[PDB]
Amino acid sequence: MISLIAALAVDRVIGMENAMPWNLPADLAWFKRNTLNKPVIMGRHTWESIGRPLPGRKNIILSSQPGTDDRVTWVKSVDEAIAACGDVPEIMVIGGGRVYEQFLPKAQKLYLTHIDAEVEGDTHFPDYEPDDWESVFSEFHDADAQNSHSYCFEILERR
């Protein structure tokens, strides 16, 4: 099973200048809980944005060029990325925009955080057809002293 996990600001913005400009510790904690002990697939730009391997996960990087770091696994196509995960129950695709586009048709589950923040950005999450997806979990949180915007955790499953 393939799942996508992402955090979306208003208008599906997910990034600007190869960064995420907000800081929401509760959402990073949610990301860690839902990805720990699972393989994670990311594109090369997202690898450069994170800047280090994510511990406790098999890190798989898509790039058309040879890898430059043997602490992670480098693959050259979507099918190779999936194969490199082995026989696991759930593969997590962690972006960015181009990677989400390619994996969305193959995904059964979306873990989305909707952040109430207006962000200028240059990268968006794919347009997804709402009729294809059932909301099975949602949890709203107001802003607090640690998290400066309100946010909604949602899990959707392909109908």
Ligand SMILES: NC(=O)c1ccc[n+]([C@@H]2O[C@H](COP(=O)([O-])OP(=O)(O)OC[C@H]3O[C@@H](n4cnc5c(N)ncnc54)[C@H](OP(=O)(O)O)[C@@H]3O)[C@@H](O)[C@H]2O)c1
């Ligand atoms: N808010 C969130 O949830 C979230 C999550 C992830 C990322 N982001 C943001 O998203 C942005 C990065 O997204 P992006 O769309 O620019 O880049 P991306 O999807 O991270 O990376 C694209 C790169 O991945 C490689 N790639 C993708 N598909 C491939 C394929 N089928 N075969 C081989 N290589 C492939 C290519 O690398 P080569 O050029 O080396 O071939 C391509 O240039 C940043 O702003 C980041 O902060 C946000």
Ligand SMILES: Nc1nc(=O)c2nc(CNc3ccc(C(=O)N[C@@H](CCC(=O)O)C(=O)O)cc3)cnc2[nH]1
């Ligand atoms: N909901 C969600 N939020 C994100 O911030 C996110 N980010 C990415 C890609 N970028 C990043 C950037 C940093 C870290 C990171 O530092 N993660 C630590 C945080 C642990 C914690 O804060 O409790 C990790 O071990 O996962 C992960 C992914 C992909 N999907 C996402 N999905």
Ligand SMILES: [Mn+2]
């Ligand atoms: Mn092929």
Ligand SMILES: [Mn+2]
């Ligand atoms: Mn197999």
Ligand SMILES: [Mn+2]
């Ligand atoms: Mn806000």
